[PDB]
Design an enzyme around this catalytic site. Structure first.
Site, PDB file in Angstrom:
ATOM      1  CG  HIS A 163       1.381   0.650   0.889  1.00 25.39           C
ATOM      2  ND1 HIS A 163       1.118   1.229   1.869  1.00 25.39           N
ATOM      3  CD2 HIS A 163       1.998  -0.636   0.290  1.00 25.39           C
ATOM      4  CE1 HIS A 163       1.012  -0.616   2.556  1.00 25.39           C
ATOM      5  NE2 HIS A 163       1.658  -0.736   1.748  1.00 25.39           N
ATOM      6  CG  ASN A 217       0.358  -3.029   6.178  1.00 30.29           C
ATOM      7  OD1 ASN A 217       1.698  -1.579   5.213  1.00 30.29           O
ATOM      8  ND2 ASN A 217       0.613  -4.045   5.960  1.00 30.29           N
TER       9      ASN A 217
END
Ligand code: HEM
Ligand code: HEM
Ligand code: HEM
Lengths: 727, 309, 727, 83
Positions: free
Chosen positions: B102, B175
């Site tokens: 990420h 997510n």
């Protein structure tokens, strides 16, 4: 478990193979017999894997690497799972800081050899004998983007070479243009902050088309020369193999007699100079952001080793002040028409790394790493670089022992009184850690300067003046070099420069910045300024129209060595052609096409509307490399369409667009037999046009004609015709 | 010298403006009246610039920020130039390690408030009163690519929210799909190594279209569910404003009585669900690799605030 | 150059020599033929120095290592001096964080070998055959002080052993007392902050005699058992060679059948147990803060190798609940009367490191580093240590690749899918960095658990209970072990414990803390409590006088194995005697003295009032090692004064003080002939006193008496007499 | 840089100036200051070139080095006057 396919097709053959034929692999597995002293010295740290048990880092064999230890199979994970914690801990700490600039880069191993001894002008050991081979490690890079940014951006490229000599590491840390944007290292943070992503929102990533870059440029005219080079097609090279390399600064060569000669370093690409066109480069950052990294790796796996010739521009100490520009000003180039490049030696890059992080990411290059026989000058940009690289590697590579990271280690002896620091590998046995000492009889010892194997001594340059923070008045000229560059370009290269400035300034949101840049262009060349202004909807004032152009550089009004294409230097080996298949290809055309390409070292990629295989007219099974959309025309140098059942792909949108895109980007296209039906897709006349090869079959001179076009790289005469074309 | 245009067109108006109408700017200058407890608490470290002298980090005014100190104007740079050395040293040490996963992400400040008290199912203070507002800071991201990779790649997207509650920071790190690829954290390094750039050459950057990823998937069928979501148009959202968010795991809510209730967390985009098409998404990674980052910033500058339930 | 002395007296002989005979040196230079598998594997990183040129870390030879580059010989230093900058940069970054606890430590290399195969109780490979030799690296340490603190402080000592086995590294990370201060790892930061220098002013450095430690102790009775050990002479060992070692926690041994046996680990010093006395130890922190580090180093250089026997206390799984304490409680010891120590093997430390920083400072030990055949238990202190050591090493050693630092590397194979991290040395060639994989046929592969060379599998202990933050009620007993310890000491050992508490509490500024500690002592033993109270000017209350003593431990009212001295185990080999010289020494005494000492392996130091040499009556020239003040009696085990011209030293204040100090510290003193004139200074009766050897000359009888006293370590019967000596 | 963990050691409380400090330096480990300047470089027009350089003067002026005369060759040599 034993998961590999029984046919052994999981593993690439350890022999030179064309791009896409086998899976790529670590260098030592792909080419185990390609060796050099540095590569051999890394054997102490190479780690294998086959037939070994999976262990922790402490050597404990692991029984179950699929599960954490828990209280019951649906219970909580326990703190005593040391196997889980070691594995996750190492994963959690994998990343290190990326380089502050040039974070995006691709590297390879190779070797260098001088053509003849240069003992008369330098005592540098690596240049003293033609049979002395010096291993090298080279990293090519962009400047602005992060390590995860795209390759085919419009930017200056870095070209850094680490020479592992017998008298020390020499790092030649250059770029692909002969000048830099700024004159004094004190402004490096300002220039870099202006080009990098803007601080509030961190946009844009790897492109200079934003307000802060052009704001800085508009207020600092010293930048205009390198900006001209970046806006030309020099800023978008086809490959790292097809660009020039330069040290930029004037350095010194020192011979055994103590004489100093000024030198500027050059790298000439033996594959020639070649660049993409902007639309193709920008679209390629999306279709394949790793295009240059990939192309370098695959060239080496194929045996198309990147080759470069090292050259020197030499200027006697007494000629220091004989030019219109200062030799110590890094924003000025030394025209080859005034001082020729003397050929010095050849560098061949012939093996990829095994592990990108260990060898590429951790490599540390520094322009201060010189060896006896070389010396610095007072160029004020170079002077500041000497401080910066040592400093930045302390935090990037975690301490002062970065020279012990395998890729950075000298291959020659290193002994001194330096001790400790984070990650200390060497275990010193010397009783002394200081000198002078009597307890180890003063070893290791200092060595006097001499003709060979002597200690480093700086050239005794006379210094005279007051302590001042002042730019030399000799550096205060900013438009004559930009103008000399402009006048040396071909007409199509000039158009591309105009288009580069025009596109970039169109992304600058504050209109006054665009206007100020146009005003600076009016100080260089009125034609250039007017063409950019027109594209921006800006009108030059009467004052701007009357600015007198800058003087010629030492009487020169052009130097053809500054153009990519004015003097043909095309090399077809290593290039690639897309072949658009159909479901009943004429095998005879394909045999002729593929053998002609193979004979010149040109690769091919067989494309279709799906993967798998297609069967030719005679039953030949043809393996498909990629689909039309999967391997776009952006990735190839030319397109060939063989005859066969053309109706199969004649109405395929992707197939037609493939030709439109290749056509727009000036690539040679060849159409055989019924493939001439695609002429209507690109609006080609019945009688044909230069740049389009067409015949009843691929026989005769069809392939020779296509290869002639490939040697010229692109079809510059088609520019006016592509203007329209909806692609 | 080098100064602002006479007309004041260098500076963005401090009012909501549509995308492209003005140059973008730092939040506190673009919307000075937009506040929350967290935004105010950052006032101790905010640093202005207008009308101040340029100095070293030790507070010494600089007279010439254009040149190094040298012995003569064409001479060697001197070691005593501490102004040059402080400026270059700070530049030399600007970078810090990017996130292991990420690393590519875009963030903004905001606030949350519950519709009604949830004290019957949880004693969490931030969910106890409809009129008690909690400042948040949210970061959206991709998984595989580095910090300088492109936004509109095909990938799962992260949706992390930091709630600054009166009883502590609560981070809801989710997510944009309701499940993950793997079952046990012990395999995370394996899965991540398989999706990331291959170790010999470090290709490809932010896409899963490569051998190692599909090798892992083919050998670990537990990954198929999240792979299905990634291959759908969920893997290429139009905007961070037009995707769903999920905590994925079952957590617990604990009320004052000690009763536990299992819970799964969701975010619903009030702008609706919308994605790109593949060809568009892939071409956009080249035409504008910062598309989602830009779009989020400009939506907030326009008053089109991302809203989620 | 040639700064070494022409006689070659700058270099120590590469043969075993007694303390002070030669200058000490790097282990590989002092004992080049002492080898083991680990020492041999370190040869790749050992760096020499003799006959090599002095270079930069990049391999460039240096000509002048005395000066910076400057503009004129009185001019400013130039930024282009890269030799100066590299050298200063390395120096500037030499230091790394010290260990959070146990920062002060001293280490050596050695080897371990079992006495027999232990395959019936464990499948650990290193314990499977008496001919299996396992290299070891051992670090001894204090707890509280920093790396630059003093050795002979009163503290618990650490005893950490790294075993480089064929199936992985096993680290046995223990202390010199059989229990710890606290029960649950959650309180470690609190206990450690309480014992460490107080936060406002960072005082005191290496001693626990301050308010915050005793505040914590007074409020946490679980600490009293280990506090009792620290206040006894166990807290001030004579040498790292003369103390016991314990793993403290109950661990598990796992055999090939899968049966688990509970085990507690022990190290028994083969040189016997011996400690200093408080005044001597405290004064020794000032005269020689490096005393223990020096002693260990010099014992190894002399061939007096530190030797320890590994011992196991073994308890069957079904006997888990048969004691009146919990086996998982680390504040409880397992009396050897109840569970004997089985002697399992011997460890010998026979080589010092080459470089302290590279090998000792960077060594990383972790109790979680176990191997197949061993397993953990639920002891709550051990459970939290499992997390701590991995975590602290990330910052102390700069990243996740600390296992690649030479001293930490396993000697056995290690292969896995972990990659990258700061200072990554290993260059992985595996095509795969994940599993399962087909591209490398899934290598390296997992290995099922088995009798030998199998993967690690945890013992499947049954876990049943709710998720709670709660101390087991079984751990809630704090006074019976302290009482067992107290009652097992000799009378003089008990006196020393009283004095330890009394001195420490006298330095606690807040009187209520001293009172609260005395209240806790009244729960252990009234006699102890009263004696400490009396020294503090405190009166026990009515209630405190009636506190019922804690119960005996499983029927025991004492265990002699807890005493340092109850059971004779003295060894004189390696001990040292001061010999006080005069200007005309009776050479017959010296010969007899030295010959007898040498036969027992006892060293001597010849002392005088100046350096140089004296000449004996017969003409023998005696070289002086040190002066009386230069090598105080604190550094020796006994003092001998031979006959001769005593008038030379009879009025020497330092000579007289030397004997007074040794007398006060209960050391054996031997006086021959006219050296008996010194009896007045220490006020010894005409008829003599036990502990004072006297005779007309230094014959064999005189020397046997002295060596018998030395075998008993100190003269405990002299305690009542030292009160009246002004020393 | 290594002892105090990065280039922002001047932001550690004891080390902070009590007088104003403003410049174009940014980032680095443990960065405390949150810069609002639109510009992180000079010269700039987007923030009207602030913060700006200040000429040397009698009070509150910019730092200028004393213009000492330098003359000699580039040498690694100890002055004979120091012997
Ligand atoms: C002639 C002008 C310059 C050229 C040709 C040049 C070239 C390069 C190249 C090719 C790299 C990447 C090396 C690699 O592949 O790792 C690089 C990195 C770097 N450059 Fe320069 N550069 C120039 C000016 C400067 C200046 C003026 C400074 C600062 C005063 C500077 C500071 C840096 C730093 C800090 C790095 C990162 C090095 C590392 O992290 O190992 N550069 N430069
Ligand atoms: C349901 C599964 C998961 C979800 C939804 C998830 C989500 C995320 C998100 C959204 C981020 C970025 C936060 C930010 O914007 O800074 C992140 C970062 C991270 N994730 Fe997770 N993740 C999951 C599984 C895992 C697992 C199993 C591990 C390892 C055991 C892991 C380790 C990490 C790490 C180490 C980071 C970097 C954080 C930092 O550097 O601050 N993730 N994850
Ligand atoms: C039975 C109880 C314990 C014993 C015998 C013990 C023993 C030791 C020893 C001997 C060392 C020094 C190793 C060397 O020489 O490098 C050490 C270091 C250390 N101990 Fe423990 N300890 C105990 C409890 C704990 C606990 C409960 C914790 C934290 C939960 C802890 C954390 C540490 C840390 C962080 C280090 C430094 C490690 C390094 O920096 O490499 N200890 N301990």
């Amino acid at each position: 478990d034993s998961l590999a396919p029984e046919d052994g097709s999981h593993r690439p053959a350890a022999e030179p193979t064309p791009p896409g034929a086998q899976p790529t692999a670590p260098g030592s597995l792909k080419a185990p017999d390609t060796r050099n002293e540095k590569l051999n010295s890394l054997e102490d740290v190479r780690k294998g894997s086959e037939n070994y048990a999976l262990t922790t880092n402490q050597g404990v064999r692991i029984a179950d690497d699929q599960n954490s230890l828990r209280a019951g199979s649906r219970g909580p994970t326990l703190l005593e799972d040391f196997i889980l914690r070691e594995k996750i801990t190492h994963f959690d700490h994998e990343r290190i800081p990326e380089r502050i600039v040039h974070a995006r880069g691709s590297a390879a191993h190779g070797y260098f050899q001088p053509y003849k001894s240069l003992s008369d002008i330098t005592k540098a050991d690596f240049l003293s004998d033609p049979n002395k081979i010096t291993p090298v490690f080279v990293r090519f890079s962009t400047v602005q983007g992060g390590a995860g940014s795209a390759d085919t951006v419009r930017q200056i490229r870095g070209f850094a070479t680490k020479f592992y000599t017998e008298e020390g590491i020499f790092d030649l840390v250059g770029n692909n243009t002969p000048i830099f944007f700024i004159q004094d290292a004190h402004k490096f943070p300002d220039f870099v902050h202006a080009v990098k992503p803007e601080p509030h929102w961190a946009i844009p990533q790897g492109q200079s088309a934003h307000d802060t870059f052009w704001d800085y440029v508009s207020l600092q005219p010293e930048t205009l020369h390198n900006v001209m080079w970046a806006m030309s097609d020099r800023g978008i090279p086809r490959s790292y193999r097809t660009m020039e390399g330069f040290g930029i600064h004037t350095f010194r060569l020192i011979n055994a007699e103590g004489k100093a000669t000024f030198v500027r370093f050059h790298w000439k690409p033996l594959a020639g100079k070649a660049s993409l066109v902007w639309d193709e480069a920008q679209k390629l950052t999306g279709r394949d952001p790793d295009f240059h990294r990939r192309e370098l790796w695959e060239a080496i796996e194929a045996g198309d080793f990147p080759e470069y010739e090292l050259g020197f521009q030499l200027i006697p100490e007494e000629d220091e002040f004989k030019f219109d520009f200062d030799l110590l000003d890094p924003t000025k180039l030394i025209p080859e028409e005034l001082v020729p490049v003397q050929r010095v030696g050849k560098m061949v890059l012939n093996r990829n790394p095994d592990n990108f992080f260990a060898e590429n990411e951790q490599a540390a290059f520094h322009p201060g790493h010189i060896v006896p026989g070389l010396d610095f000058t007072n160029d004020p940009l170079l002077q500041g670089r000497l401080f910066s690289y040592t400093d930045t590697q302390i935090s990037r590579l975690g301490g002062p022992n970065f020279h012990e990271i395998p890729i950075n280690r000298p291959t020659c002896p290193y002994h001194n009184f330096q001790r400790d620091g984070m990650h200390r590998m060497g275990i010193d046995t010397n009783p002394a850690n200081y000198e002078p000492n009597s307890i180890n009889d003063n070893w290791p010892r200092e060595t006097p300067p001499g003709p060979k194997r002597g200690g480093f001594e700086s050239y005794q340059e006379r210094v005279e003046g007051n302590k001042v923070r002042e730019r030399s008045p000799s550096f205060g000229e900013y438009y004559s070099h930009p103008r000399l560059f402009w006048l040396s370009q071909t007409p199509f290269e000039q158009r591309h420069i105009v288009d580069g400035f025009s596109f970039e300034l169109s992304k600058v949101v504050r209109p006054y910045i665009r206007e100020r840049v146009v005003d600076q262009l009016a100080h260089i060349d009125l034609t250039l300024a007017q063409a950019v202004a027109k594209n921006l909807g800006i009108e030059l004032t009467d004052d701007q129209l009357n600015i007198t152009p800058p003087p010629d550089v030492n009487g020169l009004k052009k130097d053809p060595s500054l153009s990519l294409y004015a003097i043909p230097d095309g090399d077809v080996k290593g290039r690639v052609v897309a072949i658009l298949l159909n479901d009943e290809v004429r095998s005879a055309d394909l045999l002729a096409i593929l053998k002609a390409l193979k004979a010149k070292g040109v690769h091919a990629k067989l494309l279709y509307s799906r993967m798998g295989e297609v069967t030719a007219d005679d039953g030949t099974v043809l393996p498909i490399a990629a689909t039309f959309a999967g391997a776009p025309s952006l990735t190839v140098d030319a397109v060939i369409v063989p005859c066969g059942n053309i109706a199969d792909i004649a109405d395929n949108g992707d197939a037609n667009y493939y030709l439109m895109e290749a056509y727009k980007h000036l690539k040679p296209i060849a159409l055989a037999g019924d493939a001439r039906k695609f002429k209507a897709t690109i609006k080609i006349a019945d009688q044909g046009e230069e740049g389009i090869v067409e015949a009843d079959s691929a026989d005769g001179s069809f392939m020779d004609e296509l290869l002639t076009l490939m040697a010229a790289h692109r079809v510059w005469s088609r520019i006016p015709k592509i203007d329209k074309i909806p692609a």
